[PDB]
């Protein structure tokens, strides 16, 4: 359920806020 | 060498979600996502998980190549962020590299993706 792609990357980046 | 890693810690984080543990994990891969936020594919010897994110304050560990693919590290503080769809993001706040990538040399064990 976690992949190397922009949508998952962006969700992960935002989750660190 | 699997006895060096906290087998079952990834399942514990994904199920219990408790943050008191200090698991010993191997870095499999590190990718900047964008100032960069590093995403990590981590192994506990049994499973891998790729929703680990490095706190910005730890970026020097990547920049100076202390934290790099195949190194073994011990997590000292982390935060779990459960998303609306049920996936969990694990933000690493504090960690210590116990054994360098060069000294480990290779992926430990045969871990498989968690669920």
Author numbering:
A (entry chain B): 599 to 615
B (entry chain A): 1 to 34, 39 to 119
Sentences from the paper on this structure:
The heterotrimeric Replication protein A (RPA) is the ubiquitous eukaryotic single-stranded DNA (ssDNA) binding protein and participates in nearly all aspects of DNA metabolism, especially DNA damage response. The N-terminal OB domain of the RPA70 subunit (RPA70N) is a major protein-protein interaction element for RPA and binds to more than 20 partner proteins. The RPA70N domain adopts an OB fold with a five-stranded anti-parallel beta-barrel but has very weak ssDNA affinity. Its primary role is to mediate protein–protein interaction with its basic and hydrophobic groove and a side pocket, as first shown by a series of studies of RPA70N interacting with p53.
ETAA1 is a newly identified ATR activator that is able to promote restart of stalled replication forks to maintain genome integrity. ETAA1 is recruited to the DNA damage site via its two RPA-binding motifs (RBM): RBM1 interacts with RPA70N and RBM2 interacts with RPA32C. We fused RBM1 to RPA70N and crystallized the fusion protein in the P3221 space group. RBM1 forms a three-turn α helix with a short N-terminal extension and sits in the basic groove. ETAA1 D606 and D607 interact with RPA70N R31, R43 and R91. ETAA1 W600, L609, L610, Y611 and A613 pack with hydrophobic residues (I33, M57, L87, V93 and I95) from the RPA70N basic groove. In addition, W600 and Y611 stack with the guanidino groups from R91 and R41, respectively, to form cation-π interactions. ITC titration showed that the affinity between ETAA1 RBM1 and RPA70N was relatively high among peptides tested in this study, with a KD of around 3.9 μM. ETAA1 W600A/L610A/Y611A triple mutation greatly reduced the affinity between ETAA1 RBM1 and RPA70N. Co-IP experiments showed reduced binding of the EGFP–ETAA1 W600A/L610A/Y611A triple mutant to RPA, and that mutation of the conserved arginine residues in RPA70N (R31, R41, R43, R91) disrupted the binding of RPA70N to the ETAA1 peptide.
